[PDB]
Design a protein around this ligand. Structure first.
Ligand SMILES: *[C@@]12=NC3=[C]C([C])=C([C])[C]=C3N([C][C]([O])[C]([O])[C]([O])[C]OP([O])([O])=O)C1=NC(=O)[N]C2=O
Length: 146
């Protein structure tokens, strides 16, 4: 269909990239795995703020932690309930970090989502955060020259 995946978006990891220069910090790249998890097509996601994944059981306190991170241009790692297109719930161990250019200005934000069936703690939380941070570092490389 529309918006065939770029090579970046075929990286076998769940992430999105947003452009904070664009009204409402919208998604501009979304990986195939993100599409698969969320049940949206790429055309349905692009140019939208990622908050469309939130729903009734999403903890708004947690959403404010993300808002504040973006506002302060800093990373955050949180867990929150998200919803697919068809309204199926999933937990999202979510890591955000800015991507900076060669003058240290924030160019994009990188978001990595690890979907799970439950809030994780201890070993599962640690291994999850290990995974999403390593992924974010990989994408910071991948995205640098877009
Ligand atoms: C979404 N992932 C995600 C990825 C990036 C790179 C960015 C910048 C944001 C997200 N969001 C958070 C959302 O877009 C928004 O920043 C928050 O809702 C806070 O702002 P508001 O204006 O709504 O108070 C993500 N949100 C999700 O729920 N799930 C993700 O995967």
């Amino acid at each position: 269909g529309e918006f065939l995946a770029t090579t970046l978006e075929r990286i076998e990891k769940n992430f999105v990239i947003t452009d904070p220069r664009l009204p409402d910090n919208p998604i501009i790249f979304a990986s195939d795995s993100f599409l698969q998890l969320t049940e949206y097509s790429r055309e349905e996601i692009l140019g939208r703020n990622c908050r469309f994944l939130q729903g009734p059981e999403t903890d708004r306190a947690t959403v404010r932690k993300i808002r504040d991170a973006i506002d302060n241009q800093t990373e955050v790692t949180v867990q929150l309930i998200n919803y697919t297109k068809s309204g199926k719930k999933f937990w999202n161990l979510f890591h955000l970090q800015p991507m900076r250019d060669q003058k240290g200005d924030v160019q994009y934000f990188i978001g990595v989502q690890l979907d799970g069936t439950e809030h994780v703690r201890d070993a599962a939380e640690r291994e999850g955060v290990m995974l999403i941070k390593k992924t974010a570092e990989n994408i910071d490389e991948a995205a640098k020259e877009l």
